[PDB]
Symmetry: D2
Subunit: 117 residues, 4 copies
């Protein structure tokens, strides 16, 4: 299905398989903060999106808690990827690790847990 928010940010799904996903995007001018780098929310949205698709492969679920650790800033024009991998799958919950990468560099690390419906 088409995700309005994902489309609004211009995010693309490069890979989607059981328990994993890769979403890509480009930092545009409308994604910057006052400092001129990619807004923390744009990077998080990229990761959150991969996280969402990967967990949906396991069935309907709702995110509970997510953590985002920022390591490197990205400037406008930067191409970035969110790579989601399943860390734990239980009957009622699941956790995923999402690496935000740009040109071989680990830009940020995302951890998210969902509640399986």
């Amino acid at each position: 299905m088409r995700d309005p928010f994902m489309e609004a940010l211009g995010l693309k799904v490069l890979h989607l398989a059981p328990g994993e996903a890769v979403v890509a995007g480009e930092v545009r001018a409308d994604h910057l903060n006052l400092h001129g780098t990619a807004h923390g929310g744009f990077l998080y949205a990229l990761a959150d999106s991969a996280f969402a698709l990967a967990s949906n492969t396991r069935g309907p679920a709702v995110a509970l808690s997510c953590r985002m650790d920022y390591f490197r800033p990205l400037g406008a024009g930067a191409r970035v990827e969110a790579r989601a991998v399943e860390v734990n799958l239980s009957r009622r919950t699941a956790t995923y690790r999402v690496e935000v990468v740009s040109e071989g560099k680990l830009v940020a690390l995302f951890t998210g847990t969902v509640f399986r419906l």
Copy 2:
């Protein structure tokens, strides 16, 4: 006052003062996910903006780690507010709590820590 990303999302600054900030927004059609509710990326972007604004009132700061806990889903039309308050202020770091509220209900809770440049 707002940055390019906040502008793209329709987020507005309602208040800013030392150690705190209030940002408001409304859930629009382009903020929804596959399932029709506010995309987690939107809610986080709102909280992250209040977090960033409040943290910078103490001087240039860069985000290190953030946590987002989701409690209630929101649909199109929902008016939402992110309220940031300073929890701890040290010479090199600071932590903020950001409550995301809609119609008197706590929608999500955000905690963020910055490195003070």
Copy 3:
């Protein structure tokens, strides 16, 4: 009321009520790390205990994700308290905030979420 690990650490229950709890303890010689201050694991154990006690007032539950933000170091002798309050209560999950306080100073901030059985 008290826990076997709480007992081993010398932690005591000062207060319990619906959705809340207060646990108290003192930093002993066996709670310090190589550098002479309270070990991060001790402060977390303290907060985690108050968290576990508060959530169980709503029924049995199992912890899913917890965050611990450290603000101030504590030395041997310090009287400390973990104060847990309910932030969100849903049918299947609940989240709590736990403030670790010592002599009126916020030493650490803990956030924890559980799955209700």
Copy 4:
């Protein structure tokens, strides 16, 4: 020597640049009311590896840590905390610590420090 690690009976199995492994056994004084390993015990194990790993880069103080619980452990269970560096910057560093018991991922810990 770490007094708290000693008190919990934690042992350092490996220490190298930016990494560490700490081991321990769930004893009767490490349980919760449910009869399983107290969340605080599992965390102390991970936090210990985290601390040892980060301090190989220089004196540092923990800022924020996350602990995700996946499986419960019973008394007598042998557990390990394996710390690896995920990011190293001039002022901060982040580590991933896996808590393992009998080949199973019991918990995942993420921690960031401020390098003094």
